[PDB]
Amino acid sequence: NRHYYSITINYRKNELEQKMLLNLHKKSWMEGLTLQDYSEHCKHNESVVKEMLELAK
Amino acid sequence: MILDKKFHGILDQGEGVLIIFDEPPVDKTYEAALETIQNMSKVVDSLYNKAKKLT
Amino acid sequence: LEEGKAGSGLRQYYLSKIEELQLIVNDKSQNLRRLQAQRNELNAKVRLLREELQLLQEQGSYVGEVVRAMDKKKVLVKVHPEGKFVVDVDKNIDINDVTPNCRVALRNDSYTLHKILP
Amino acid sequence: DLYSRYKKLQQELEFLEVQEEYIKDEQKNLKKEFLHAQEEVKRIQSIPLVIGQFLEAVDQNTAIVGSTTGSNYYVRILSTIDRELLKPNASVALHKHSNALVDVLPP
Amino acid sequence: AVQKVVVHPLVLLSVVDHFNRIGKVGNQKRVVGVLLGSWQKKVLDVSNSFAVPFDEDDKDDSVWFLDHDYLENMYGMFKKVNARERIVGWYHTGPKLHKNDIAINELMKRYCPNSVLVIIDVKPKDLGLPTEAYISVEEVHDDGTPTSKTFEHVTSEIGAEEAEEVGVEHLLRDIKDTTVGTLSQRITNQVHGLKGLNSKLLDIRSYLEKVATGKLPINHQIIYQLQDVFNLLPDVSLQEFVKAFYLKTNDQMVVVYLASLIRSVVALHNLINNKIANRDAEKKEG
Numbered sequence: 139n140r141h142y143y144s145i146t147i148n149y150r151k152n153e154l155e156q157k158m159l160l161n162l163h164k165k166s167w168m169e170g171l172t173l174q175d176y177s178e179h180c181k182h183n184e185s186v187v188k189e190m191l192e193l194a195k
Numbered sequence: 196m197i198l199d200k201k202f203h204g205i206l207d208q209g210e211g212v213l214i215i216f217d218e219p220p221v222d223k224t225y226e227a228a229l230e231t232i233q234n235m236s237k238v239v240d241s242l243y244n245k246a247k248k249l250t
Numbered sequence: 251l252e253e254g255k256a257g258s259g260l261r262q263y264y265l266s267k268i269e270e271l272q273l274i275v276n277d278k279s280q281n282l283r284r285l286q287a288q289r290n291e292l293n294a295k296v297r298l299l300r301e302e303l304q305l306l307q308e309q310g311s312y313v314g315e316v317v318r319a320m321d322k323k324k325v326l327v328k329v330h331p332e333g334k335f336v337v338d339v340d341k342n343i344d345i346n347d348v349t350p351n352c353r354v355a356l357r358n359d360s361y362t363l364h365k366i367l368p
Numbered sequence: 369d370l371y372s373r374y375k376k377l378q379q380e381l382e383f384l385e386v387q388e389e390y391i392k393d394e395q396k397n398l399k400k401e402f403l404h405a406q407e408e409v410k411r412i413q414s415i416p417l418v419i420g421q422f423l424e425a426v427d428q429n430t431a432i433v434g435s436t437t438g439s440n441y442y443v444r445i446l447s448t449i450d451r452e453l454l455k456p457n458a459s460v461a462l463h464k465h466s467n468a469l470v471d472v473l474p475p
Numbered sequence: 476a477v478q479k480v481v482v483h484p485l486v487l488l489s490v491v492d493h494f495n496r497i498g499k500v501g502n503q504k505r506v507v508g509v510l511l512g513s514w515q516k517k518v519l520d521v522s523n524s525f526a527v528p529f530d531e532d533d534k535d536d537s538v539w540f541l542d543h544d545y546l547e548n549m550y551g552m553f554k555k556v557n558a559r560e561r562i563v564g565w566y567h568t569g570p571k572l573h574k575n576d577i578a579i580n581e582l583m584k585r586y587c588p589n590s591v592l593v594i595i596d597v598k599p600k601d602l603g604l605p606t607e608a609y610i611s612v613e614e615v616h617d618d619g620t621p622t623s624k625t626f627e628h629v630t631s632e633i634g635a636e637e638a639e640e641v642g643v644e645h646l647l648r649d650i651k652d653t654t655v656g657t658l659s660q661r662i663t664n665q666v667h668g669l670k671g672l673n674s675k676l677l678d679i680r681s682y683l684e685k686v687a688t689g690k691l692p693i694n695h696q697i698i699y700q701l702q703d704v705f706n707l708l709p710d711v712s713l714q715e716f717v718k719a720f721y722l723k724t725n726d727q728m729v730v731v732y733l734a735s736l737i738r739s740v741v742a743l744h745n746l747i748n749n750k751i752a753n754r755d756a757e758k759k760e761g
Contacts, residue, residue, distance in 0.1 A: 151646060155491050158599040162484055163643060163650055165604050166633045168663070172670040176663075184722060188223075191729065195226040227732055234736050241743050248750055258371065265374055268381065275384050282391045286398065293402045296409055302444065303412065306466035313432055313440040330439040355426075355442045364442070367426045400651065400658075407652050 314356030314363060316348055327356065339363035413470045414463070422460040422472075433460060433469075445469055480519035480591065480608040480631050484639060486510065487606070489524060490568055490595060503597065504531060505569025507579070509546060510593065511553070512563040519591060519608070522560050525549050536575040541582055564591035564611075577624045580611055584624075592626060602673060606631050617696065 151159075169175050179187070197204050203215045253259075305311075314327045323345055326336040339348070340362035348354060348363060355364035423440060425431040430444040431454065446468045453460070459473040486508070493506050508526035512519055527545050532538040550562055565583050567576065572594065583590040592609040599605060609626035616622070635643065644650070653659065685693055713720075 149646065154494060154599065155488070158487065158491055158605075159484070159643065160647065160650065161599055161602070162487060162605070162633065163647065166484070166635070167650075167653075170604055170630070171674055172663070173667060176667065183726065188220075188726065191726070192222050192226055195230060195733070223729060227729060230736060231732070234740060237740055237743065241747070244747055245750070248747075254371070262370075262374070265377065269377070272381055272384050275388065279384065279387050279391060282395065286391060286394050289395075289398045289402060293398060293405055296402075296405045299409055299447070300405070303409075303466070305444070306412075306463070306468055308467075309465065310433070310441040310443040310462070310467035313442050355432075358441075365427075367432075403654060404651070407654070 308358060310358065311364075312356050312358040313367075314354045314361075316350050316352065316354060319345065319348060319350045327354070327361075329356075335361055337361040412466060416464060417461060417470070418464045418467075419459070419461040419473070422454075422456060422458040424456060425454045433462060433467075441467065443467055443469075477517060477519060477610065477629060480512075480521070480629055481634050482521040482593070482606050482608075482631060483523075484633060484635055484643065486521055486524045487595065487633075489526070493526060493568060494597070504529075505567035505571075505573075505597075507541075507565055507567050509549070509562070509583075510564045510566050510591065511550075511560050512591075513560060514563045514588065515561075519563065521563075525553070531575065536573050537578065539575050539579050541579070543586070546586070562587040564593070566593035566595060568595050568597055570594070570596055572626065580624065584611060591629070602670065604631065604633070606633065618692070620692065 196202070197206070203217050205214055207213075312329065314329065316325055317328045318326055320326050320336065324336055324338050325345060325348065326334065329335050339345070339356075343363055348366065353367045355367060356362070357364075418436065420436060420441070421434045423432055423434045429447060430442075433441045433443055435441055441462075443462065449469060453469070453472045455472070459475055460469050461471060461473060462469050489508065493508060497503065506526060507529040508524050510521065511524045512521040527542055527549075528540070530540040546562075554561070562583075564587070565580070567579075576592070580590060580592060590611055592611060594607050594609065595605045608629040608631045610629050611624055612627065613622045614625045614627070651659065
């Protein structure tokens with residue numbers, strides 16, 4: 139640290155970055171029409187998750 | 196050989212009808228019922244601790 | 251008379267039952283806030299594990315072995331090869347307690363002792 | 369005093385009332401924070417890592433570890449792992465950077 | 476040919492930069508940036524991009540202004556720093572496909588290969604996905620109408636590679652992760668009917684407007700497959716699916732016995748400690 143110091147770092151985020159990046163990331167975790175992968179896992183409850191239910195037991 | 200359960204079927208004398216069927220999901224009620232019976236001693240032994248500690 | 255003793259008296263009895271209701275809101279606030287202190291201390295505890303995460307970024311720490319203590323408060327310590335790093339260990343631990351020819355706990359860069367080891 | 373105790377006390381009723389939805393807000397938020405920090409310390413534990421070997425446990429929740437290079441390292445172990453993995457001759461596996469153990473391997 | 480694309484959030488953050496470096500003029504048109512990415516694999520992978528000064532006219536749509544020298548210099552210096560990515564396509568940030576966009580597209584169909592188009596939104600008020608990959612292909616039409624450049628939607632996903640996740644997640648501290656259980660499931664299960672509701676309601680109302688008030692080949696043919704598949708669910712009689720509801724309801728009964736039994740096991744330490752701690756701290760308090 140002698141002869142050689144540092145400086146603090148803060149940020150800035152405006153609401154277009156906030157909601158564009160926010161809905162960008164929520165949409166990056168959501169689907170297209172968003173109803174798509176629902177019934178898939180509803181019916182993997184009948185096909186796959188029953189095995190995970192027995193293993194859970 | 197139905198009584199020794201080598202295959203699926205059940206006979207008839209009045210009608211002479213054979214019916215063939217099966218039950219694949221065997222492992223649900225097993226783990227369910229054994230989870231009930233193993234939780235019995237949990238609750239009853241709990242009641243032995245509590246029946247010990249109160250009266 | 252017979253109102254402040256009787257009608258406002260039973261109004262005051264109803265106020266005492268309201269104090270029982272604030273004994274219920276009271277002790278719910280008590281046990282819910284003790285649960286809240288529990289989650290605060292537990293999430294605070296894994297937050298202190300994130301305080302440990304910089305010492306995870308330390309790549310751990312080494313194993314010092316002192317073979318000889320030096321009187322200038324700069325202890326020569328036998329280290330893993332390319333070692334033998336003579337150093338003053340941390341200020342909260344005295345030098346004379348560190349007995350020579352025994353294994354200790356040493357940081358890998360700052361070379362400060364933690365404890366004596368068997 | 370006596371009849372003033374009523375309306376004086378009503379303010380204590382309200383002030384104890386206001387702690388209800390407040391403790392609701394804390395109890396709903398801090399468990400979300402608990403799974404925040406829980407998942408965040410979970411995602412520190414990543415599968416690419418270096419495997420060492422265990423030598424001795426000198427006190428509780430802190431031990432020493434022989435690295436693959438032979439140099440012995442002093443690491444405070446992670447708290448979630450119980451005392452079964454404190455086996456002295458074990459196949460321990462730390463991180464490649466964090467150098468804290470996620471799991472030991474069966475020989 | 477190409478089934479899907481991958482667009483990283485870096486370029487859309489550079490569309491936040493498109494709305495930053497304006498300088499407040501009063502124009503705010505569909506400012507075109509030169510999309511860069513990886514056409515190399517069968518999947519398209521956007522890494523980064525830049526933008527170019529683009530002007531149209533007020534009245535005329537077909538006046539449009541690009542640069543080849545700026546493309547070859549910015550792409551030249553970018554290829555000098557990183558040659559693992561090449562030119563692929565472009566995008567306008569306007570909500571609307573203009574008539575000119577076939578000709579604006581045609582410049583990068585020439586000099587670049589078959590270029591992809593992306594429609595995104597100037598204001599991210601759309602709940603839906605802002606990015607739509609439109610493949611620039613000419614398709615032969617059954618009515619006999621002459622072949623033209625046709626923008627068919629290629630499905631898209633928005634993914635981040637490694638560090639973009641870390642930086643974005645550090646910048647937010649507001650979003651929550653996967654977090655299966657009550658909340659992240661049940662919130663999708665809250666707004667999910669609104670998410671198909673605003674889609675369908677957003678479509679069929681102005682669609683129904685273009686029914687009575689519309690002409691000029693709206694793809695009248697795809698209405699037949701459209702309404703056909705819509706009439707492939709003729710309000711099912713459920714008679715076979717009754718036993719399916721016995722199945723999911725019996726799995727439900729399994730969740731009943733698991734919830735009841737396991738919570739009742741959690742009652743143990745509660746209904747022991749409640750007595751044994753309190754009465755012993757009490758009896759040794761005095």
